[PDB]
Amino acid sequence: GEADCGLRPLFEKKSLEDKTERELLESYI
Amino acid sequence: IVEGSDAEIGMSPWQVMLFRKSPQELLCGASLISDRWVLTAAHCLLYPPWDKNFTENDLLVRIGKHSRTRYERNIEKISMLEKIYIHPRYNWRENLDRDIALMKLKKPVAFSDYIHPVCLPDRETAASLLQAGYKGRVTGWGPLGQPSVLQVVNLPIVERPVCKDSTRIRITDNMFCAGYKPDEGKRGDACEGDSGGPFVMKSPFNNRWYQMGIVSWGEGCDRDGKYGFYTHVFRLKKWIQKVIDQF
Numbered sequence: 001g002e003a004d005c006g007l008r009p010l011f012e013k014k015s016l017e018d019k020t021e022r023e024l025l026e027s028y029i
Numbered sequence: 030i031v032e033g034s035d036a037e038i039g040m041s042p043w044q045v046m047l048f049r050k051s052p053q054e055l056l057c058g059a060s061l062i063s064d065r066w067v068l069t070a071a072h073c074l075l076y077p078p079w080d081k082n083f084t085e086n087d088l089l090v091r092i093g094k095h096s097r098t099r100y101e102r103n104i105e106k107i108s109m110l111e112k113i114y115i116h117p118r119y120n121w122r123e124n125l126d127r128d129i130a131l132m133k134l135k136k137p138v139a140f141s142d143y144i145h146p147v148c149l150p151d152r153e154t155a156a157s158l159l160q161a162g163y164k165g166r167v168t169g170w171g172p173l174g175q176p177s178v179l180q181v182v183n184l185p186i187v188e189r190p191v192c193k194d195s196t197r198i199r200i201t202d203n204m205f206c207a208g209y210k211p212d213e214g215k216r217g218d219a220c221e222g223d224s225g226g227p228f229v230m231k232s233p234f235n236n237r238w239y240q241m242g243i244v245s246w247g248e249g250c251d252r253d254g255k256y257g258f259y260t261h262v263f264r265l266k267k268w269i270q271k272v273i274d275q276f
């Protein structure tokens with residue numbers, strides 16, 4: 001709860017991207 | 030979730046589901062912020078006009094789930110509740126201001142590939158991510174035919190003035206709204222059963238997911254031209270910390 005928070009074992013922890021996360025990051029203008 | 034797509038396995042490992050014990054029914058979404066603490070909407074636990082006033086023993090949470098109906102052997106965990114804390118200033122009569130509750134698990138849940146906590150935002154993350162047009166993500170098993178697996182939508186935060194004109198309710202700075210305009214750039218949305226669930230955002234600066242909002246009130250998957258409202262988690266962060274430190 002805060003050290004490892006927000007880093008998904010099956011995504012960030014593996015350098016894997018989910019299918020729609022780009023849509024979020026692209027939105028940050 | 031309406032107009033979403035299928036979430037991937039492990040994509041939302043802080044997703045927690047609130048159930049009524051008896052009879053078994055899915056009440057709300059919720060989120061995992063540590064091995065013992067679960068954040069949700071107050072209206073998921075206390076809503077007097079609908080005779081809703083749950084104690085701990087009325088409820089359970091299931092964590093690490095993906096398929097609504099399939100039992101996920103060695104993946105999913107079930108937990109009972111030690112204590113429920115609803116914000117003392119939660120305004121159920123008028124506008125659901127401060128629609129926030131915390132739930133303490135009887136026993137710590139073990140983290141795994143499928144169960145993992147989301148971050149609470151810090152000031153800098155609130156200041157830079159919480160902008161009109163920036164997109165967040167909502168996940169859930171709200172009715173829109175009902176989801177087989179966990180559904181995901183990504184929704185833009187709406188400008189405060191557009192939020193204000195969208196409803197007759199007296200909105201407050203403790204809430205924000207999100208959704209696509211009645212025009213069209215998609216038409217996704219959280220629904221009734223997604224309430225309590227997290228509105229998350231990913232930080233480009235550090236690659237972490239932060240819970241910026243809690244899905245507030247919804248009825249059906251129909252908001253009649255309106256936008257869903259979200260409890261502003263950073264503004265209620267001191268309260269969250271106060272409850273956790275004392276209890």
Ligand SMILES: *[C@@H]1O[C@H](CO)[C@@H](O)[C@H](O)[C@H]1NC(C)=O
Pocket residue numbers: 075077082
């Ligand atoms: C809900 O139930 C508890 C326990 O019986 C009671 O103390 C409380 O007054 C109720 N609260 C509301 C707002 O109805």
